Structure 1
Amino acid sequence: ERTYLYRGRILNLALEGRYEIVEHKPAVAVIALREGRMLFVRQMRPAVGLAPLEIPAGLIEPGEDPLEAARRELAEETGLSGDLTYLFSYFVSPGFTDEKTHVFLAENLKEVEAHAIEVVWMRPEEALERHQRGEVEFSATGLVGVLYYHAFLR
């Protein structure tokens, strides 16, 4: 049984026996390549005090399925639309939270909207080199995008 210590905006904190559990909405993330550049985004993230390299991502809102949320986040964060294909999912940190991320590939991108979030097109090889030299941090979604590219999109 779970007893709730805090019910919030994008998380709840519960105790389940000895375990501390953070309930969190599920998320999506979108991997997109164009002319050998991957579509990264950066934003200040107060939890870490910096702007890591991420890919377009966000929470699934009421009424949405993961594909629909992926389309929405791509449009809202970058002004693009594409043909989306589901790839895989992962639990971000299942030792304490239930957040699950659904990852999609986007192809054939088109600008639909001419408009906080910085769009950072960057070759994945360069993102990995900058990270190895200490110049940028990754989110899980950014690292998954870079590794997926190296594994399957070259």
Structure 2
Amino acid sequence: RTYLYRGRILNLALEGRYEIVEHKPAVAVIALREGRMLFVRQMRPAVGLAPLEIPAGLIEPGEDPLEAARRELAEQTGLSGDLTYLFSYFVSPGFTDEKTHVFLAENLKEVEAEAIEVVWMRPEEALERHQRGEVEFSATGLVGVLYYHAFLRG
């Protein structure tokens, strides 16, 4: 594997004819309260718009998935809760090694008090808005919506 670029959050490598983008692993937090899911939005230069996501971020040096999940939740929404590991997935294995660890957060409590918009919204509404072409989803946002519909109803 030869490297053509070593950047901040990614390295561009070449493994034969395969173009490979190395990327730090990430975490995402699914949190439901009073029927609303905790989404977040921020301008994403890579896509030119603000998709609907759930609290997510990169795992920092010395951090394990659970600790990163806790930090991301607090820094982006000012909340903390009881976290449970759910599952993980490679965002796009065809070209990048970015792996995302998803957690569920319960018993949320505000521990703290601008570039990231906190968007509490019923998953049913996020889905319909998306179906209407009004809002876009990040993989984390869609996973949160589907997860809710499958195991958090009732």
TM-score (norm 1): 0.99
- Alignment partner of 1:70: what SS? helix
CA offset at residue 35 of structure 1? 0.2
- Alignment partner of 1:109: what SS? strand
- Alignment partner of 2:74: what SS? helix
Separation of aligned partners in 1, 2:51 and 2:81: 24
Report if the CA contact (8 A) 1:53-1:137 is conserved.
Answer: yes
Aligned to 2:71: 72
| Structure 1 residues not aligned, in runs of 5+ | none
CA offset at residue 69 of structure 1? 0.1
CA offset at residue 86 of structure 1? 0.1
Separation of aligned partners in 2, 1:50 and 1:112: 30
Separation of aligned partners in 2, 1:89 and 1:81: 21
How many residues are aligned here? 153
Separation of aligned partners in 2, 1:115 and 1:27: 21
CA offset at residue 115 of structure 1? 8.2
Cα RMSD for the two superposed structures: 0.7
TM-score (norm 2): 0.99
Report if the CA contact (8 A) 1:78-1:115 is conserved.
Answer: no
**% of aligned pairs identical?**
99
Aligned to 1:149: 148
Separation of aligned partners in 2, 1:119 and 1:76: 11
| Structure 2 residues not aligned, in runs of 5+ | none
Runs of 4+ that moved beyond 6 A: none
